[PDB]
Design a protein around this nucleic acid. Structure first.
Ligand SMILES: Nc1nc2c(ncn2[C@@H]2O[C@@H]3COP(=O)(O)O[C@H]4[C@@H](O)[C@H](n5cnc6c(N)ncnc65)O[C@@H]4COP(=O)(O)O[C@@H]2[C@@H]3O)c(=O)[nH]1
Ligand SMILES: [Zn+2]
Length: 355
DNA sequence: AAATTGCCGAAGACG
DNA sequence: CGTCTTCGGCAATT
């Protein structure tokens, strides 16, 4: 049954070819524009991120996430209150970024506005492809493209500051992978740079326009590609596990529920991905994720998610004091609403999987 | 030093 | 299952 759902969720090679060809053409053109010439974003490099490049994209290849990352040396971070995730950026000259300053502080809003303006002008010159820039979203770090290939494809272009220093201390007790992927992996991952994206902290019913947010799309991608306690997990001379399949089933469940209940707008795939990371830490043995145990693994994930929902607590995997299910982010009656919907599908063999 | 190229793992496709 | 194929990612090369 779950097996038949996964077959339905599996992407088609022909759809992947058509979508990728068009997406890569458009992105490459955008990145080229950033490089040339008197652009403040001149040194940006591309990193592909999110569901599709993690191989956990379901149903259709119609959503692509890409980071344009700018190394900016000699920055000092100041934690915006005690959020753990949000920061203000200051500088340790006649530099490319001096006009994005709001006093001594590097403004996320200003920098993102220019970045978006450049993309809009470049997109206007694309004539062989039907692509447009979607309207700006409140507190989004993304410049979102809309492509008609003729099928609809969304591409999020995410500006990110790259910092080569050690990660901010709010992450010190995050990434608890020591009994799973191990201490050498954790240490090496934490020696990689960290990123800030111009997503603003929500302060009441407004946004703080200078704040940036930590991003670990890079570490997350590595983990999804290197997810076993055994090095050969899912390799050609190793054993297939069901970790990713279990994540797909969960994303699907949430996706289907979101399509018909508007009171679930505050929930998203990132909550599901965060939940399963915790599950992978809780159950690190590959033997616990044998494909023969898919049903029980999915049920265990469901139970864990319901418990996060009920206790109003889902710790960011990298920033443990940052609660994705705080009352401030998601109202209590939204969590109770999702709770009842999940229990129903769980007690009725997921009729919603039949669309 | 932008752009090309080699190399192969991940996973879809099909028997 | 095994074998084949395409795509993504990386960095040496020029
Ligand atoms: N592409 C992309 N979109 C993002 C990201 N963060 C947030 N968003 C979209 O930006 C709009 C405002 O974000 P919200 O905080 O209101 O809603 C998000 C956020 O709560 C959380 N979420 C999603 N992704 C993350 C990541 N990567 N880290 C931490 N929290 C995350 O859940 C909601 C998910 O909805 P979303 O598709 O992200 O839409 C957000 C809103 O459009 C981002 O990093 N990358
Ligand atoms: Zn595996």
């Amino acid at each position: 049954k779950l097996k038949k759902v996964l077959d339905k969720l599996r992407l088609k090679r022909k759809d992947i070819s058509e979508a990728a060809e068009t997406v890569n053409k458009v992105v490459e053109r955008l990145l080229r524009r950033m490089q040339k010439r008197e652009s403040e974003f001149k040194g940006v490099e591309q990193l592909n991120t999110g569901s599709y490049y993690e191989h956990v994209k379901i149903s259709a290849p119609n959503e692509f996430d890409v980071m344009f990352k700018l190394e900016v040396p000699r920055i000092e971070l100041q934690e915006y209150y005690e959020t753990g995730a949000f920061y203000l950026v200051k500088f340790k000259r006649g530099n490319p970024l001096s006009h994005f300053l709001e006093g001594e502080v590097l403004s996320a809003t200003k920098m993102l506005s220019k970045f978006r303006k450049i993309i809009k002008e470049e997109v206007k010159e694309i004539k062989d492809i039907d692509v447009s820039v979607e309207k700006e979203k409140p507190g989004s770090p993304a410049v979102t493209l809309l492509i008609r290939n003729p099928e609809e494809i969304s591409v999020d272009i995410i500006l990110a500051l790259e910092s080569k220093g050690s990660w901010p201390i709010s992450t010190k007790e995050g990434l608890p992978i020591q009994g799973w992927l191990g201490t050498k992996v954790r240490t090496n991952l934490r020696r990689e740079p960290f990123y800030l994206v111009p997503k603003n902290a929500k302060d009441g019913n407004s946004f703080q326009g200078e704040t940036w947010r930590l991003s670990f799309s890079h570490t997350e991608k590595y983990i999804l590609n290197n997810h076993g306690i055994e090095k050969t997990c899912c390799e050609s001379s190793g054993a297939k596990c069901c970790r990713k399949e279990c994540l797909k089933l969960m994303k699907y469940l949430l996706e289907q529920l979101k399509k018909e209940f508007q009171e679930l707008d505050a929930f998203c795939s990132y909550h599901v991905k965060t939940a399963i990371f915790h599950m992978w830490t809780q159950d690190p043995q590959d033997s616990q994720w044998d494909p023969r145990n898919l049903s029980s693994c999915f049920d265990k994930l469901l139970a864990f998610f319901l418990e996060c929902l009920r206790t109003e607590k889902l710790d960011h995997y990298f920033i443990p004091k940052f609660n994705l299910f705080s009352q401030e982010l998601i109202d209590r009656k939204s969590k109770e609403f999702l709770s009842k919907k999940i229990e129903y599908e769980r007690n009725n063999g997921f009729p919603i999987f039949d669309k």
